[PDB]
Symmetry: D2
Subunit: 338 residues, 4 copies
Amino acid sequence: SMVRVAINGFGRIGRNFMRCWLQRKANSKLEIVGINDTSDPRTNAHLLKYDSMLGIFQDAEITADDDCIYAGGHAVKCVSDRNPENLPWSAWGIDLVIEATGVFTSREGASKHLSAGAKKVLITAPGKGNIPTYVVGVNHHTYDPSEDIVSNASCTTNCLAPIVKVLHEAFGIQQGMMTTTHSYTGDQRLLDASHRDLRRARAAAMNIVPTSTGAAKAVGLVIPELQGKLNGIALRVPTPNVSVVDFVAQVEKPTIAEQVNQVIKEASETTMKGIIHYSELELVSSDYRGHNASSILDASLTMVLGGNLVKVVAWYDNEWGYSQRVLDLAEHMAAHWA
Amino acid sequence: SMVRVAINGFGRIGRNFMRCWLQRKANSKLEIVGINDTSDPRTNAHLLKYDSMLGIFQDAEITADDDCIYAGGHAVKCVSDRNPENLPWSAWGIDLVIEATGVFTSREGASKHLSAGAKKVLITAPGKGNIPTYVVGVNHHTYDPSEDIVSNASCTTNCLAPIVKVLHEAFGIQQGMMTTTHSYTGDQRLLDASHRDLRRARAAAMNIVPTSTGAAKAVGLVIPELQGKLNGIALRVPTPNVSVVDFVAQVEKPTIAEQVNQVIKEASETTMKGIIHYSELELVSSDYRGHNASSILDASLTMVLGGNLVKVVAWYDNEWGYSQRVLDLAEHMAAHWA
Amino acid sequence: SMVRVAINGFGRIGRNFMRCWLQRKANSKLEIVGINDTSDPRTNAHLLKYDSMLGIFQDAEITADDDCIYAGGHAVKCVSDRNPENLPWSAWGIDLVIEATGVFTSREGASKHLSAGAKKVLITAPGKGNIPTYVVGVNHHTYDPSEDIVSNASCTTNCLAPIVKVLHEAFGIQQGMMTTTHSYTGDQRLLDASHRDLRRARAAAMNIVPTSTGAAKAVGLVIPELQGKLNGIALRVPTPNVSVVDFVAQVEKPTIAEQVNQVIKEASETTMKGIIHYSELELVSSDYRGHNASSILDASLTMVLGGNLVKVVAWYDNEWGYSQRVLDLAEHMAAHWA
Amino acid sequence: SMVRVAINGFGRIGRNFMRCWLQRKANSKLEIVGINDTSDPRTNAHLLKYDSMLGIFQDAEITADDDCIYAGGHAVKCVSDRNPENLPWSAWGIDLVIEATGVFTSREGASKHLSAGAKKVLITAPGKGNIPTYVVGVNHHTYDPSEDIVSNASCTTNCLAPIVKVLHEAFGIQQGMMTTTHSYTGDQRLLDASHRDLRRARAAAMNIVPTSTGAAKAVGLVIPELQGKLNGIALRVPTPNVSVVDFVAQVEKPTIAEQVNQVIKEASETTMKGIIHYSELELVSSDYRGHNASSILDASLTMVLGGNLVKVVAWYDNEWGYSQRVLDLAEHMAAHWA
Ligand SMILES: NC(=O)c1ccc[n+]([C@@H]2O[C@H](COP(=O)([O-])OP(=O)(O)OC[C@H]3O[C@@H](n4cnc5c(N)ncnc54)[C@H](O)[C@@H]3O)[C@@H](O)[C@H]2O)c1
Ligand SMILES: NC(=O)c1ccc[n+]([C@@H]2O[C@H](COP(=O)([O-])OP(=O)(O)OC[C@H]3O[C@@H](n4cnc5c(N)ncnc54)[C@H](O)[C@@H]3O)[C@@H](O)[C@H]2O)c1
Ligand SMILES: NC(=O)c1ccc[n+]([C@@H]2O[C@H](COP(=O)([O-])OP(=O)(O)OC[C@H]3O[C@@H](n4cnc5c(N)ncnc54)[C@H](O)[C@@H]3O)[C@@H](O)[C@H]2O)c1
Ligand SMILES: NC(=O)c1ccc[n+]([C@@H]2O[C@H](COP(=O)([O-])OP(=O)(O)OC[C@H]3O[C@@H](n4cnc5c(N)ncnc54)[C@H](O)[C@@H]3O)[C@@H](O)[C@H]2O)c1
């Protein structure tokens, strides 16, 4: 029977994850039975239904009362406590917590759900410290059913890793530089305001904002042969969703642009089907909203110089594509449950 | 000698106020000696100098250490405590606190600065309850030197009131409706997220967001004859700064557009000089950045029907113009410090 | 059998109209057989399918060659000539031309399609001079089957007129002021550049840009009792689509907000069904994308002072809603093709 | 005495060039005496003074009549003819034409100014065909005084070339990939509309838009040893001005990030002073508005892997910094006039 899931943090990723599940609900091993968030159920049902990016949820009615959010007859219990130790996970029989607050990414933070009664936690972000990290289509079959806390990495890592994996196997990646031109996120400020990062303090819709990213080093955890070989940065820019990765690799086997493209295309039809999509179309960021792939290779932009310097460019829907992956990782854990 | 001022909340209004004061510092009866804010002095010195809206501060060098921000040799002490009861106002000899956090606008909230030792508080927002409210150029000469807590109203009210006062005295305002088309503010969300107001919850730079405003009722507190005669709404739109008021009045004395324009132009040259600016130019919001007036009447947009229904439109820089008026109100209180 | 329609100008309105028709194609008396536009069929097929605002067209396959656009097997002939006198309207047997270029809105301009062979022209904009103007749900039943050139007015007029008509019949509108806070359009500039209107010359996505509008006077042509009683302005703001009308009326019959709301709700359920939608929800512009109504009354925003000064606020999707009404007007003309 | 200059095309670059000159007018060998543009002098004086990006021109009064634009007593003659063969260049004694329309970048196009009577033309864009290309601080001392038509290259080339030149001399560039994350320009569409490039057809303020750029190949013309070794792309993003270049080079001499930074910093103090600025500050795009350097190296973002794969990141103000360079190239030509 079903794995009972709770969502902790009903934010952009929490609510995209819930909409992904509501559309794949008929063939799932998961049942979302609870949400904890700092707001109330009426606010949250409103935001679940009325989304500036995804539009109005159509498939089922979404309603709320003091206690619950109702999404097409399914009643999802709600609570509101900032400290996960106090959560009613035992009383609700929660198996798996989708940890989407952004604030409990270390083992000590995420463990508080275990001590409140949950059996496992899936963190929708890179882990801090020693937390096993999975990227679906790259290393998710190495999942160890005895792990209690896992990470689904970041959106950028889920875009980059599959492409790196295909290029590494075909050409041998020796070193690699990435830049993601990335939509702003809720971590940034609307107008100039205090922040730990002096660049992310700055009005997000008016600026190109450079920032660091662990995505390129995190690829080394999911593809252990590349540990320490990749580095990169992020530029946040004034769009609200959809991002793009530009990756330049120094490879061992000399090649040309048509061959790099052919290798990716073959992978997108076979071993990376559903993970990498190969696009030959001249599209822009709006067109990739709602796309289900982790990475959409923009084949016209591929270029190679001197045999060994390879550049590829891939799109990702950082909210929705990432949430589809969280859901796939969760379904995978449900099918391998101990 | 000088009135010693502390800023509580070094946000958009706090930092605009500080820049206003640094440029009018030679003519001033105030001396800013302290800042309380939830962030540290190095962050705040960086944000003071580097502003997405105002640009790089040029007049003087701005530096910081653990304890202080230095703005052209002047040392501004810094502290960081969310609870104003704990603040060192007696120890720093603070006379006047500029209350710019947005969070202590009731008498009970603002009184915590008195009990920490400040002699007076000027709230940079409408007051809740019974707090005397002043709009410079409308009723600031009614200020009573024995008042310990005052409000400088909102940006919208400072734009609307002077125009209303001139139109009321010339034509007799019987009723009036206002809509402000207003730049987004820090109160709104960057991407759809929880908020007390379900409209302000929504991505601010992607949406037109209606909201309620007390600006129109607050005009009745500064022009007591009009209490209960005005109402209005706000539409937040995707610009970071500069706003516009549209005001439709039912008046007693029949008139036409040219005459309504002439009455405002006359007032802008005499009794409202420096408060209302009259513009015959066809400008857009960007052109009003840094403008010092509380209201800039856009004269081409004035229209009248049937003698008695009058529409006027006025611009305001909601951050900078408003902060100029906080500074004027403070200088006025300094000059009458009995 | 079918009325053969050609689209002249395959811009935002032309392409929205075509999508409207492709989704209502089974119930239709029209058949779109031709397009004239300044660009070629491959470009136009790409733009028809890939739309930043509407997303990717899903219902049918859309393809092109040198001569034609194919939308689900239906072949739409294409030509590219700036001068409508040269167009092959007789040769293609065109009955009705949808004039959507923005450039042939006078009788003399629009008559060039007649002289090229079309039997009638429907202008997707206000007409200049003496052109009969229809707003569906307000005066479209006065359409006269012998009229050869008609106007569907503007988006703003389609939003404002039905509401005015309901309020006039219930309360007696004596005078009225309108401001539309309107999404930017193709008529404006991306960055400051030359334009007939010095305000529209200015960077559209960075500014609030006031402009004149004939929408309020045009309400007098569709509701002849109100000719000369209404006036208004527009403020263009940095959203790409969806607009809002704010209307302040001086009325004869004293009233209050609840009653004004009840009169509009009643009309939305009966005589204005499908034209006015009544909303009690706290939504923002993004939520009205794709909405089929000409006006969506935002009921919480309704306010009344002194019995006789009434403010209402209504949303409209200026591209899609308006195009639905062009399609309805065209279906109406088809049904009465005497 | 003075070189008499005319501006053909009074667009973003034409008007930025004019403001650069008005501020450096006291030590110049150039005198701007005429403008040709498709609009009239009153429109153009308005746009010259009221700029959404640069703000209100302060230094001098700017006025216009039917014939002329006046900028602080200096009367600049205006004409309006799309075809440069008809221009009054002989009658106005024009020596140098600043060709800023974007439409006369080939030798045959630009020569029409010579045949109207001008002696030289400086194209504010890459040339098509065999036109000598200069980048100030890279190859401008190779100017040949007998050349009648020159190119100042693009904004991206002016940012990239100086940095490439310093890296090549210190490390030996073997191959190099660039991506510029670039503000939208007037070449793009405000809302989805026809364009030769199917990506630039798309709403520029709502999308990340990839496009090709000749900047990386054009570096090979100004640094002839690197011909054919560089390639790259552009991503247009929703900011109106200021751009950033990300450059990844494969170099011969093994190095680390601190050494790459030290070499650039030393060049910025000496041979590239005024061309490259070295910044150690954590700033965002808004902060670089109005910056006079061709390239501002963001030193914190530099990274190196395996000795030979080097990434650097540099900002540029694509309007203003580029126009300063156009002015410097023109002054250089004036000082070497034959
Ligand atoms: N593009 C993306 O948005 C994206 C993609 C991949 C991963 N992520 C990661 O997913 C996580 C969430 O990011 P997001 O974009 O949803 O941010 P968000 O701020 O929209 O969502 C966080 C939610 O958690 C709530 N919250 C905060 N602290 C809480 C607490 N102690 N208890 C309960 N609820 C709490 C917030 O109110 C909000 O509802 C972050 O770790 C982020 O790094 C984001
Ligand atoms: N257009 C405008 O921005 C505008 C105009 C007029 C009035 N106001 C009003 O001015 C006030 C502030 O507006 P803002 O736009 O500057 O907001 P903001 O969020 O930029 O500023 C608030 C500042 O105070 C800090 N803060 C919050 N709680 C605190 C506490 N308990 N102790 C100390 N510091 C705290 C924040 O960290 C921030 O630095 C509000 O009352 C607002 O309504 C704003
Ligand atoms: N919100 C709106 O967009 C809106 C709403 C209602 C009405 N309108 C009106 O509809 C009309 C078009 O608006 P739009 O927003 O679609 O503009 P747009 O610029 O997107 O569309 C015009 C189209 O016609 C083409 N064109 C221009 N001149 C031509 C000629 N001589 N021959 C053939 N084709 C030509 C353009 O290339 C473009 O494809 C205008 O009259 C406008 O006022 C627009
Ligand atoms: N970031 C930048 O804007 C940038 C930087 C470097 C180079 N450039 C180049 O500078 C040139 C101008 O670009 P821009 O951004 O000023 O564009 P723009 O469209 O703002 O300026 C072009 C001007 O020329 C006018 N014009 C067009 N055709 C004409 C003709 N036949 N005769 C006279 N005037 C005519 C236009 O009306 C406009 O005033 C282009 O070649 C562009 O590639 C642009």
